[PDB]
Amino acid sequence: LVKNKCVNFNFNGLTGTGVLTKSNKKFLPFQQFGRDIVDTTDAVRDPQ
């Protein structure tokens, strides 16, 4: 895993392009993805 680089990702079948940084969001221990009011993947948890 790389960070702070515009890099394509394939996290557990979820594919896209973007810059991956540290997140301060709190996830319940069953949620994988993360959305917003626009309904786009904003945060994802490492499958590993």
Binding site: K26, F27, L28, Q31
Partner: peptide, 28 residues
């Protein structure tokens, strides 16, 4: 000492808390 109910296809409005926890869902 237990209850049984059946599910039906409905539409619901759910309010997620900042820490994404569902609170106070409302029927439609």
């Amino acid at each position: 000492d237990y209850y049984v109910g059946y599910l039906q296809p409905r539409t619901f409005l759910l309010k997620y808390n900042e820490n994404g926890t569902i609170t106070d869902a409302v029927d439609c």
